[PDB]
Design a protein around this ligand. Structure first.
Ligand SMILES: NC(=[NH2+])NCCC[C@H](N)C(=O)O
Length: 231
């Protein structure tokens, strides 16, 4: 045949957006969204995996065509690439996760031997910018959680959207809110596209809007337990 390929770069360590499930398959909200957008584009989807901190550079170098990796729209990133919003609202707080049996009070974070967090993320960067916080940085959300569940780190930091979904499975852990200062606020998730392609940006933009017109993204949010009036 004639098979026009569309390559989406991701980092499948990030449930419920992209992760490896009980069966060893790469699944999630961003993967279903990629499939739905690829149908609108008239293209066959190919998913490729990179380190989360290498997605932007690979996008810019044209090793991939788009990024779908639950990537927060931030001012810093918008200077480098185009981010087309598709899920979520402004983020003004992080979730601190601890065992319910934890004796020391969760806050302040400076008190603990270490705080576990996912690498390359805006929450890691926030933590690292604060004096007195000893940060341990991990590849995946599961690793971050397992570190707390087995007593190796007394606390972890997740984003509120991930925290709400994944802690449904860990009833012995509790969430505590940490407000961010306004300069550290970020927006929702963006589909990354190379910035100097005003054309390709318009077509994916249109694809996103069309799927929302059709109720498709809303149905995927419910499927992946992301539909979230709660903030
Ligand atoms: N697929 C991933 N590893 N995603 C990490 C995203 C974390 C956070 N939303 C950020 O944009 O920094």
């Amino acid at each position: 045949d004639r098979n026009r390929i569309w390559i989406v770069g991701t980092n499948a360590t990030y449930p419920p957006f992209e992760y490896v499930d009980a069966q060893g398959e790469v699944v999630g909200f961003d993967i279903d969204l990629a499939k739905a957008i690829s149908e609108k584009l008239g293209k066959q989807l190919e998913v490729r995996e990179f380190a989360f901190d290498a997605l932007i550079l690979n996008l810019k170098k044209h090793r991939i065509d788009a990024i779908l990796a639950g990537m927060s729209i931030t001012p810093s990133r918008q200077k480098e690439i185009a981010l087309l919003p598709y899920y979520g609202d402004e983020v003004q707080e992080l979730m601190v996760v601890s065992k319910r049996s934890l004796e020391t009070p969760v806050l302040p974070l400076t008190q603990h031997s270490s705080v576990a967090v996912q690498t390359g993320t805006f929450q890691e960067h926030y933590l690292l910018s604060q004096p007195g916080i000893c940060v341990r940085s991990f590849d995946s959300t599961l690793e971050v959680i397992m570190e707390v569940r087995y007593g190796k780190s007394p606390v972890a930091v997740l984003e509120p959207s991930v925290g709400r979904v994944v802690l449904k499975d860990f009833p012995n852990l509790v969430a505590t809110r940490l407000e961010l200062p306004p300069e550290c606020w970020v927006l929702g998730c963006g589909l990354g596209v190379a910035k100097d392609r005003p054309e390709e940006i318009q077509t994916i933009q249109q694809a996103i809007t069309d799927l929302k017109s059709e109720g498709v993204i809303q149905s995927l949010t419910k499927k992946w337990q992301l539909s979230e009036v709660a903030y």
